[PDB]
Amino acid sequence: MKYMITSKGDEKSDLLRLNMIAGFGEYDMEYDDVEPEIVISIGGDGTFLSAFHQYEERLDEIAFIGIHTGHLGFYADWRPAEADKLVKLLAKGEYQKVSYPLLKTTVKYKEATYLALNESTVKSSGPFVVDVVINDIHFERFRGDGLCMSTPSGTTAYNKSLGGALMHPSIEAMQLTEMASINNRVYRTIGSPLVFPKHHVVSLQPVNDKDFQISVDHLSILHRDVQEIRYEVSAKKIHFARFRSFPFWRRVHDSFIEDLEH
Amino acid sequence: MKYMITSKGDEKSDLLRLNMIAGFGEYDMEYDDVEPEIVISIGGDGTFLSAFHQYEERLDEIAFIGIHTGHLGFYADWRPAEADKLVKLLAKGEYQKVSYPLLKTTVKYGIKKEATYLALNESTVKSSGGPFVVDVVINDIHFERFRGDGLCMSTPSGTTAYNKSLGGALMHPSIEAMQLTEMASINNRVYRTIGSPLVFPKHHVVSLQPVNDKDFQISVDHLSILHRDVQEIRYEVSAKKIHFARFRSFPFWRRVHDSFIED
Amino acid sequence: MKYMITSKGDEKSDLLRLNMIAGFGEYDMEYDDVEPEIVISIGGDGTFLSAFHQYEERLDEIAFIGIHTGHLGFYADWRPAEADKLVKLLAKGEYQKVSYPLLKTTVKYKEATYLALNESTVKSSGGPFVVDVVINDIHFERFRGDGLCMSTPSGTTAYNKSLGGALMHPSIEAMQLTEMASINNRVYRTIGSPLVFPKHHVVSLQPVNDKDFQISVDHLSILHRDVQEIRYEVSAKKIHFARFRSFPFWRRVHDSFIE
């Protein structure tokens, strides 16, 4: 079937990319970059995030595959030495598909919609002060650096560094974590990370400042005259192609704990 | 239908209990503390915790109701003044049922029989005196070697309890999962731990296996007893769920708001 | 003696400033913004930091007084109405001096020294922040996250607290280093815990690849390019406060975060 391969930029990612295209030359797989069914990412998680947003409009007919050139990633779980096996396994078209939940970021000032794979942070452009609304009701009023709404697969990313909990991707939910919150007498926050299920809307409403630095995954720009920032578990899901059992907790173990065989 | 009422023990709770019983008497409601279909807890979350474990063999045929006599609890929603409105909505059967996930705790010993436990809040494992050292095995795969005070596995509804004090994340009780939080992990070179709380879905099994000491202080909610000659402690989301009689619409996040932020 | 008064810029601060100078000249008080011995800050903690950075060269000859026009701060403690008796006591020279430790920040590439009253943070200029933490000419860890924060004892109740740092009394001559979203994994293992360093201890931050950092000293943040080394140590200079009443540090902490 149709496929394509993305690259990080360095010689290593480019060389391996050309190798796989050559390998698929002995199989009935039409190389296409405008309408593929199998997107392969070579490099790191950042490279995977780019490939996701590059084809976020066709997540329905695309199974993503990750290859890490450097250290082991959570989206890039295939080794460069296993590229030969990858080509032969991809040829038959035999693979189970695994779907991960996504985050729907809606900004209201014209309504814009963004799909997050890892997280969607909201900072200020001075002091960051907003009001957290959960399903059309007041929960708290945040003051600090910002807020981070993470996906299950994204819990191991920025969410982890912010003290958030690690959540298995089989769970369809989203997690809200604080970023350098100041818990004084005036601005009281929950402190603890908050995990929201489907059909739950987290609305971030401004207090006095309308300019907020809204970021989505690997993309961070400045939005102007913002009135409301909505968050909910998107109906859209990213599909992966598995040929080998590589448990999510193993990837967590090999990343943060230890990797004895490497 | 059959029902029973549990009381905290104080005057206000016992007083409210007697009047509710008399209230149900004016309808088709039989008092039965052996096989109740409805269990009403009057007091607090701790009192509600006792009522749960009192009928943990009949959770499939029981809809629980909580009434707080003091401060607001996550299980005891109803106000004592709403007891009159409660006794009538129950008699008519004008209510829906909501279910929260539970935690299954299996304790295996040396070959003596294993013992299983259900938790509404959480289940914790600590040492019997010295250092607490266990191997955390996730789905038959080793994850970390833990050294510290203990480990806490919490239910979704139990996240607002001991879990939160330990730095755990607050989960919505609709989510079928379980959360593992550390209790003062040394987290060094020899005993490297994840640090972050772990949220496990259904059909996932967390195995705690002894390294040296085989005696552990195992706690389930309010109950905490010493277990000797332990070879394995298994955690997994139970297939059994606790059922709540729903009348109003009290948001879980509002209860969190009223308890930790402001009321 | 030779004094001066700084203002936030608002109407309330400027009015109270003029109402203070008028009562100042009523006594033996020569206004001097060149050789001051008493600096009165009117506004908030942010206004106080400005008054501090305005006279870093002569900190050993100046006693500071903070008056909050807005909310109560750890520096601006005096009330807008308590400025009446403040004029009298300040003229007779009865106040006691209280000294707080300061943080020295040196950027290396000809060096560039900075003094901080609250803290000094180092973040990346866009990409990931990866540096090597060197304690006393010995490597301690390789950090990868949003950045690091070296806080003064008096600055612990500020940004340091938000980052999970500890609150230490300003009578302790030390500096505290806290992490900013450390990834803390295999190849970038970090201590996690906030580190408190005494005097004569030097914390050197060294780049790995990118040498462009967003160095921030208190209220200002400069995008330093071509950075080779960032050194932190407890400065020999200390800020002096004119003590009139008795307002305990832990009491100020209680009023802020505990209600």
Added chain:
Amino acid sequence: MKYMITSKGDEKSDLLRLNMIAGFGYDMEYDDVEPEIVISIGGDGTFLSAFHQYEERLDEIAFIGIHTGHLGFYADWRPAEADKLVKLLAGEYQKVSYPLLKTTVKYGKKEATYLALNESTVKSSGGPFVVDVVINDIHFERFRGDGLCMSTPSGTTAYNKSLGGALMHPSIEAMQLTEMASINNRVYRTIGSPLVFPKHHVVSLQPVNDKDFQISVDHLSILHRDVQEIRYEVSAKKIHFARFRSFPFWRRVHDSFIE
């Protein structure tokens, strides 16, 4: 001079112990009653016992730590260097002193005083732990949770570390307070952040309802009934180490947690 050696219990410690004593068969006499030099073999736990065993004469005793297992913060030296320590001990060495924690327990009778090398903790006797934290005769917060930990500077790398506390260099004469599973709701509001108190500061823990507490001092933990007040302050007494080579505190922290 007079000396003595304590053992952990395992064969690795007792065998190494007997080998060292034979090495002083110099002008060194084995005296466990009035020693001038105390050598601990095993781990930090073994060292703690040796400390409390000779807390009567801390001013005239230099301690040496040897770890048969993994590296400790008090048990510095590896058994491979045990021989070189013998020749060096028989007296070319300096003396390093670490601060200690004084714990005072009042009842409702007399009072009890204890010295801690690592930390002192106070927990409940079964139910919820609820106390009032009083700093210098001034109320600070009403704590509710598992307990509170007051740690020495050298004890920060122990229980304090696991509780999310800050790491302090043992040259800083202070004490650190950390929380144990604080519920931190609207009725029981706590600071959350660890608190570092200097000398001459008294932290008083006062009961609210229950007066029975599980008070621990280092490795010892006993139940105290009818407690009226638990006072914390930096002790005037210090523990003396016999410094041989140069093993920095931060390097020792690195080898424990970073590696």
